[PDB]
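Replying to the earlier thread about multi-chain prediction with a worked example.

Input:
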Amino acid sequence: LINMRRYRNAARKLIHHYSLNSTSSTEYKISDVVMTMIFLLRSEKYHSLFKLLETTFDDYTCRPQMTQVQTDTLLDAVRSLLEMTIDLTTVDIMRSSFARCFNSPIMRYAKIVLLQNVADKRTTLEELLIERGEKIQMLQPQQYINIPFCDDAEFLNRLLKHIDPYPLSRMYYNAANTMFYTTMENYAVSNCKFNIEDYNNIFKVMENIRKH
Amino acid sequence: ELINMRRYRNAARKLIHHYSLNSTTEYKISDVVMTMIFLLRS
Amino acid sequence: ELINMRRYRNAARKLIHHYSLNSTTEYKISDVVMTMIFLLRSEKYHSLFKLLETTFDDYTCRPQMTQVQTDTLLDAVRSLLSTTIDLTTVDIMRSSFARCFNSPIMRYAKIVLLQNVALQRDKRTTLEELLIERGEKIQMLQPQQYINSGTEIPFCDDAEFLNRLLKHIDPYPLSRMYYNAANTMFYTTMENYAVSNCKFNIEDYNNIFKVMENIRKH
Amino acid sequence: LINMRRYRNAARKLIHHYSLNSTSSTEYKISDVVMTMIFLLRSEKYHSLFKLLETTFDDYTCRPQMTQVQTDTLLDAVRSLLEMTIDLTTVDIMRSSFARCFNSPIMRYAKIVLLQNVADKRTTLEELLIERGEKIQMLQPQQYINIPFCDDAEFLNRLLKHIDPYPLSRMYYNAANTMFYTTMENYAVSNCKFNIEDYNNIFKVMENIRKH
Amino acid sequence: NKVRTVTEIVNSDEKIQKTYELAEFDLKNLSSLESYETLKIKLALSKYMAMLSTLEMTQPLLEIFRNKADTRQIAAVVFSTLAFIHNRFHPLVTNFTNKMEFVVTETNDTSIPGEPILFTENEGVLLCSVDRPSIVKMLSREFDTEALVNNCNVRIAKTFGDFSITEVEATQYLTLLLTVEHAYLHYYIFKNYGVFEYCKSLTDHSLFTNKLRSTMSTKTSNLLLSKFKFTIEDFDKINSNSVTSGFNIYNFNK
Amino acid sequence: KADTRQIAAVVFSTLAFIHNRFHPLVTNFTNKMEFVVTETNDTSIPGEPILFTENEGVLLCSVDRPSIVKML
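Result:
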């Protein structure tokens, strides 16, 4: 007999991280993987997800064939587990993450990786720039534009009072990690090499900008 | 059938033989999950 | 008969015994082709043939094998070799075959074209973009270590040699010497700018040598 | 069950390279050899070619005896596989190439070789020069000769417009490799030692010519 | 336009002055442009194609060389290519050697391995040998017409902002032009330094550097094969069979 | 998805606010510019959700709506 609630909570947290649906950085151990897999097996309506993630043990065995109703049901199951949008690419992210976690060896220090192996056309940033630029130029513009900056002291005072208890550092961390994860997921989904040199050089540019 | 019983079983045998006696090769996290699944299912 | 069945069979036994267990002698490409031909031709080894063929590229998969299938694969591979094995042996042999199938084969020589002169493109470049590009190019070079004999600055206090060099260069006007040096520096700089398709900023080159007035005024 | 189309494409490319009928330089792996041999075995009308190339495994086992109809049928089979002329010397080149590929050991880096062991009289360049010079002097001349260099600006402009999109470097590569392969095949067929010192000295002569 | 430079030393008011003419720098810059050299080579090839066209030689070169029966076209094509190359070397003579004969070779038994176009004296007149199957094999070989040989930024900025000559035909024209260029270098050594030197050069191409740079390197244009530096892949490994503990005191060819 | 005017106004106002922060003298941003909203990966830029381009007549701004939705 196992505790359904604890296993469900561990599964929820680990899947939240492994789906890139949350920026909560909590050190995850092998125990959380064991709990999430056991809960996935035990719960009847998560059997599809459990089989999906268990197929990742061998790299040569790929995703089971699911008819549209099965994919929709699994999407509803994932949504219920996360109580949050969620779609097929989230499932692909989860599959890749769990595959890399499972095939990884037992080790003393957490391994830091980047999203990869999701979604034939292995491209770079510039070819995508050209192609999507042409495609965007194809698209018809929707709105044509042809400005109040009020400094109402009382209103800004009330806004500051509302914002004052918020730990600015936490807000910056959340925003930066959200932008980073969205950029990485867009790169991986588009099958484009994510050049972290450029992304880190963005921060380096900000740092060099400040001190002048 | 959701559990490939025998492959899980040999994985658990190998892992528990390694941990219990050969305290001194290497295994992946997948084998640990496999061993726990075998222990629960049996 | 097109296939010499038994010689193929022993070749496959040897190759698979080498790859699966003896991960540490040597074999030719012909033996690899032989092993794959044996696996395809033998009916009971079709699953193993497909599993190993999935290693050709990174866009091939295998349906999840049920229990009876994995036992059939296991005793088929055991018939290939009495020693006890498991799915881990299959995994390591598959990885070895994946490494083998990606090994390049012999190819005939080809005429390789090398750029004769670093020809620049039509669009003119400024000094800054040229500096960025050339610095990126220099980054790829392999630096060499220079170790001086000692830390002391080289010098010479031999009077006789010093006045002797001074006397030898005494009849040599400083105006002509400095003019020649400055003009050859300028000509080389302009030639490099022209060859590099880079815009020459006359004002910057003039500003280079304003330390004259900086010294004179202060 | 195997994919006939993929194996046929791999066989086509590998045979194109190994017959010296193409300058396309694509890194070929052991997988391509496996695919070409399997396709040759499986296809009924390529059985002659498959047996021919399989006999190359042992150096002591030489080419099977084929009557003229069989050789003609195999030539048609090779032509169909390549959809292109092709004759017996192409088959000899293919046999030698596949023999050397098969007897080569498995190795991490591609082995660069030159054509050899094709077509008794082991000669050198000078004896061939004398002999073929006498034979040519025997031959009666066909045409006796006893010049417009138009600079029509519009016509040259149109010609340049047509030629402009062509990547000159690719054209030079194709021409140079074609000349090299024709020279090597003529040397090997004539059983004359190909002195690559001289051929490389040709390029060295061009390089030394330019800088003066 | 001219640019003036002044040098002044701190011991006097003397100023020494030099005048630079910008045309030299402009010429170097133009010679450094990739598009300029590409235009030069493509213009030479276009002139060759136009010269063939005005001689009715519009049919593809492979088709011309595939016709065994009609020898006149092959002889005319080879003669025209030789004359074009001769005019490129000497831009004063429009007509090639006023009298010469052609013999077409269709057999390996009388073929030269590596010199498809050869020249000889029959004691009365120049004779040119044409190895037709060799040229056919050259032109009919499939070409690599999809691979790229090594600006994306200008393309990105642009994105954000009638004779049918295929690439195969142009490559065939360039192939024949280079082959006849090699033949013409051999023929030039022949005509200017004797049959003995010609047959010495046939077995050792390294004499080209000495028998061309004396006159051609300072009087004629650039050679077509000099547009790119050609090397054999893994040349050192294949050449390892013939290695000398050498001592080169007359290394006239680097 | 239906109401594009609000998205265009929000992005334009944010751009104008940032422009005023950089240059505290101009209260109105570029007096004329157009907006196009992207709802597809097929025409999406991996890492630059808001992009700018010239259609030879007027500034055009691209807004990757699903990317911003996934962010927020």
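Chain C has ten helices and two strands.

Feel free to reuse this layout for your own posts.
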